[model samples]
Target: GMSNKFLGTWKLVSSENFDDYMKALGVGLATRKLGNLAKPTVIISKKGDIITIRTESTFKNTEISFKLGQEFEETTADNRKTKSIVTLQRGSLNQVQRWDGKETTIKRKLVNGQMVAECKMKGVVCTRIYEKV
Candidate 1:
């Protein structure tokens, strides 16, 4: 049984095709090499009107706080400054990240404690799944 609804910790269970995802994004060799070597966990928390998102790992630690129904910005895990707009629709959180370069389009949604993210570059589409902890 679960303890919380959709606000809790989630682990990086199984990561498949992540490299291809990065490769499709045109990530350099050195960065992509370390990207796979790192394992990160995400913690989601809500306080009143603000939601805090955090991803922690040995190689990198990233955190951002923002509000739903509004557009926010952040420098993501890979050190790319991105502008994101998030909305809560139906039973899911819909988000899109458009950076200054690379994909310029990364879409994610949180539904039922399962978060799905997608990014495409050069006509290559890659996805990642983060399951609840």
Candidate 2:
């Protein structure tokens, strides 16, 4: 019943249990420290098969865009390093990221009436919650 249910703009409300999530992604310690303190402002826009997510923080701003069922290159805000190809799966606005050829998937779902996004990589799971804007 949760198919393409996410098709509008949503904003980041808060995040919980993201430490392990960042560490698994190989984010540097300094960056992680900043990330912990940073309150990310996220905006996600979706139209048909195309989706875009924009995250803003005091230290950095990042944007990711891709179409459903297709892979595209992505670059982070600070380093400008492009290391991953992102793909969106059907049925849900979920995504799989292949970073330097290694596959990792992230899923977005509505839990307890809140929007939640999750990514599991290198044995660590990170979760972010959002709200409709």
Candidate 3:
């Protein structure tokens, strides 16, 4: 499946507009500062029908394991509790999360041998690029 293309460890190389994206999610100044400075490593794995995305950094570590198209409760890195679902479409993994009447979306895909992640909330968007390791 499309998940095969994403199965690997990736190290963050660059980030764009992440501060404003975190701001859109109501992240506090201190947390945003740390989040901005953290260059997280992402690991993608699959077992049967379950897919897990794990993120690690000196600042924080988090993981989510789920089946495609299934909704689950998610406690995000910023400590927001939400309902989240992930789907694979056109070679990209697209995730939508909703909490307290607000929503956000994150999309990840392979681009020029790199894993590119885009996070969006309201009208703010952040793009983070990771190289395969």
Candidate 4:
């Protein structure tokens, strides 16, 4: 599986359109500012059929562990409670979260030896790149 390629610590290289994406998700200005200021490192690992993805930053840390295609309860960093699921499709890890009738998607794929994450909410899209470390 492509999980092997995603297993490692990845340092954020760049983030684009994150402000708009946060706004689309109804994030308050203060939180959005902090989120924009913090560059998080992603650590991915797997045990048995469960995969864990962790994000660490000076501002906040978040993590989720789940088996592919299984729905689980999730509390987002911004404190939204959601039903979330993650699945592997093609070469990408696709995640969807639903909360209070709202939904968002995050797709992570490897591009040229780096991890690229695309987050979408409403019509806003944010792209963040991370280099394997």
Candidate 5:
């Protein structure tokens, strides 16, 4: 299953329509511009009940940690004001992010024929494929 296969460090190879997604998140134009050119690195590490994802880019670096099937707070890197509780489902690698006490689900899935992490953020999805070094 995805749980066993997807635990590791991954480098962002390519992203499509990321600017639009950032804009939807209310990120300013300047920040979105930098995000477009920035190549973000993501590391998804799992240990027992804990799941940690470290995202690094030229603009900022952020780490999100949460227990499996349990909720935990997360602060976005672009705007530090907002906070969200993220949860990881058991038996599957799916994630749900509830922001501002409201549900804004983001699911992660592995695409067939590609080594990638596909993120669905409030329906505006993007796939970030990686190669093992």
Candidate 6:
């Protein structure tokens, strides 16, 4: 319903506590350093029930595609295997990934014309903002 609000390309504006989040996800120093220094552009595409979110940066580019309420396989940015599923709740997009028998979730909402992505793992929480380019 509100998917149109999230459909388009968005550039990274700011991030908070991403390093700790990456560490909790088991990303190494090399990738974390690169991840922290990289400003990625996110492209969200929708085709019926399927949606694809791609994050592109100079250092590393990653993309994942999944259907609503269906589980799919994907390799994460840190090269981890995960079974990813996503759903729409109200005005927000809710995603859950199972990796190595552990679960990670991300909640993305459109806020003031910006896309706010909240990622969490363990005790670490990472928040990133992406604005239209």
Single out the weakest 10-residue window by summed lDDT for candidate 2: 78-87
For residues 4-112, could you state the per-residue lDDT of candidate 3 as single tens digits?
7799999999999999999999999999999999999999999899899999999889899999899998889998999999998898999999999999999999998
Query: What TM-score do all the candidates reach, one by one?
Result: 0.76, 0.75, 0.97, 0.97, 0.76, 0.95
lDDT of 6 by residue, 61-80 (tens): 89988888889998887888
Model 5, span 1-133: residue lDDT tens: 2365567766777777677667666679888889888877777787776778888887899998776655666777675444444444553356555565543444554555334555555677765666533
Q: Which ten residues in a row have the lowest lDDT in candidate 3?
A: 1-10
Better TM-score candidate (2, 3)? 3
Whole-model alpha-carbon lDDT for candidate 5? 0.64
**Candidate lDDT values, in order:** 0.69, 0.67, 0.93, 0.92, 0.64, 0.89
List the candidate 1 regions with Cα displacement exceeding 4 Å. 1-4, 101-114, 119-123
Model 5 scores a TM of 0.76
Each candidate's clash count:
0, 0, 0, 0, 0, 0
Ten contiguous residues minimizing lDDT sum, candidate 6: 1-10
Error of 4 at 109 (Å): 0.2
Per-residue accuracy of model 2 over 1-133 as CA lDDT, tens digit each:
2344454556667776677777667778888888888866667676665677788778888888776556677766435344454444454456666656555566887766567888777767777887766
Q: State the lDDT at 53 in candidate 3.
A: 92
| Decoy 3 TM-score against native | 0.97
Ranking by TM-score: 3, 4, 6, 1, 5, 2
For candidate 1, write residues 41-101 as lDDT tens digits. Answer: 8787888878777888888899878887566777876777778766665545555666755
Q: Residue 62 CA error for candidate 3 (Å)?
A: 0.7
The per-residue C-alpha lDDT of model 6 at residue 87 equals 85
* Candidate that beats the other on TM-score, 1 or 4, i.e. the better one: 4
